Amino acid sequence: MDKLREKINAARAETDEAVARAEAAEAKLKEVELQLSLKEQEYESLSRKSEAAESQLEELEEETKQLRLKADNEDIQKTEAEQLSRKVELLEEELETNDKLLRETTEKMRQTDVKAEHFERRVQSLERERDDMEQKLEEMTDKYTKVKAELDEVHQALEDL
Amino acid sequence: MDKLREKINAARAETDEAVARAEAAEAKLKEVELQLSLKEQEYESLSRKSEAAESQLEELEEETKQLRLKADNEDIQKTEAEQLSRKVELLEEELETNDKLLRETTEKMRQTDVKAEHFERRVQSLERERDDMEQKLEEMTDKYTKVKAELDEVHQALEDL
Amino acid sequence: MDKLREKINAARAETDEAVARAEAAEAKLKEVELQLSLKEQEYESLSRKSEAAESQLEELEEETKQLRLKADNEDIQKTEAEQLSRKVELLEEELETNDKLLRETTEKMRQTDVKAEHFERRVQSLERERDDMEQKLEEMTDKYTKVKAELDEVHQALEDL
Amino acid sequence: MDKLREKINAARAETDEAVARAEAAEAKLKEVELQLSLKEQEYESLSRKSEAAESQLEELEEETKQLRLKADNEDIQKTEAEQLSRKVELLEEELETNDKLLRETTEKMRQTDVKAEHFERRVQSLERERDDMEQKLEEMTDKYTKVKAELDEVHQALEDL
């Protein structure tokens, strides 16, 4: 009849609509499942890359601390070398001054030694001359005493006549 | 009745099967959509983290290079500092030796000056004594000559008797 | 005297004889005349009687002839009467037979009329019942056709499921 | 003498007169005697004739009475025959009328029989048709009940769907 055929058409329409819904939903489900699996694989790859990167970061931080210590030591040594160069210059100036002073003092000592030697040679010559003239004076005094006594005796002799 | 009831049963079963499959597919599609959204969010967060890690890696690598620049020169700088320190110690030893030599030279100069003053005073005394001896010798010689001449004149006069 | 007396005696005797004979003859003549007269009278009377007898004889003879005319026909007339009486009795018997046949025919006609009325009433009742059955059969056939068509339409619609 | 002769003449005259009387009387007597004898013979003949005539009269009277009886019987029979002829005519008329009536009644009975036979044949045909349609109505009623129950069951089945 009319109503029975209409109900049958409605039943077939409901069934076909459900089948179309199922087909579309299954297609979209397949697509999203493939997308989810691919995104999980990408996340795993990126996580392994991040682990490697963090390991490299730790290693680089350790190396950086070591190099910081060594570079600070190098800078300390460089400052020390600069100050030692300046100190070398100062000490060389002081040594030049003191060496000039030492040479001047040595020359003055040599001059004083020459003066002392001159005076000592004068002493020796004066002593020689003094001894010689002292002996000569003794001789002449004896001779004069003798001849004066003789002359007085001769005068006393000629006085009586 | 007969195959009419069989037909309505089979049609109802097919319709219910289609509806159930559609509902299950739609529910699973919603679930996988939600899971994919969450996975995308966490993957984006991990990507941001990995980018930050890479930036830190590059910064640390550049710092490591800049620090190696001085860390490699640490030892050569230490050698240069040791050379300059040895030069400084040599200059200091030379200064101390010069100080000692200057002290010794000054001491010897003072001693020689005292010796020269002593010898000069001795020269003065000896010159005074020598002049005194010479004057006395001249006087004694003159007196001896006078007395001898008088005696000889007397003796000569006696011959003409 | 003598022969005179004889003569007178003889003459007287002859005369007396003649007279006596004459008287006797006359007396006998008178007697025979009277007898003849009486005989004539009685003969005339007898003649009258005989004439009357002859007249009566002729009358009776004529009457006898006239009566014989019918007396001879008596027997033939009786035969004719018997024939007519037999015809009458035959007609009477035919009338009685016709009366009996008419009674029987009327009785049978009444019986047949009653039979015909009975059959006519039976025809009326049977026609009423037949029309009732026909109407009911038409109605039942129409309703069966309607229900069968509806069932077939339903079953046809079920095939297109 | 004169007187004697006169007496003799008178005697002879008397004798002759007596003789003449006797002769005449005897002649007349003979005649009348012959007449009387002849009349007696005639009377005897006529008397015998009269006796014969009276005998014939008696015989004729007896015959006449017999013929009277027979002729009266003949006349009675003739009247009877005439009346029987009239009665024959009357009875023939009555028989003709009654025979016409009998034939009319027989024809009416035949017509009534034809009518009754017509009605009886109608009865038989109507009974045949009634039985046929009654069986057909039973069949159709059963079929309609069955198909109506089936249709109601199908409606109840499709109602639940």
Author numbering:
A (entry chain A), B (entry chain B), C (entry chain B), D (entry chain A): 1 to 161
Manuscript text:
Cables formed by head-to-tail polymerization of tropomyosin, localized along the length of sarcomeric and cytoskeletal actin filaments, play a key role in regulating a wide range of motile and contractile processes. All homodimer conformers are approximately 230 Å in length and exhibit head–to–tail interactions, where the N–termini of one homodimer contact the C–termini of an adjacent homodimer. Each of the conformers that make up the TpmCdc8 cables consists of two α-helices that are wrapped around each other, forming a left-handed coiled–coil structure.
Conf-U1 and conf-U2 have a straight coiled–coil structure, whereas conf-U3 contains a central 24° kink. In our case, the structure of an isolated TpmCdc8 dimer was predicted accurately by AlphaFold 3 (57) with a rmsd of only 1.56 Å when compared with conf-U1. In conf–U1, the majority of the interactions stabilizing the overlap junction are of hydrophobic nature. In addition, residues K7 and E159 form a salt bridge. The overlap length for the acetylated conf–A1 is reduced (5.8 Å) compared to conf-U1 (9.3 Å), which is also reflected in different buried areas of conf-U1 (1531.1 Å2) and conf–A1 (1279.0 Å2). The interaction energies of the conformers are −50.5 kcal/mol for conf-A1, −27.2 kcal/mol for conf-U1, −55.0 kcal/mol for conf-U2 and −40.3 kcal/mol for conf-U3.
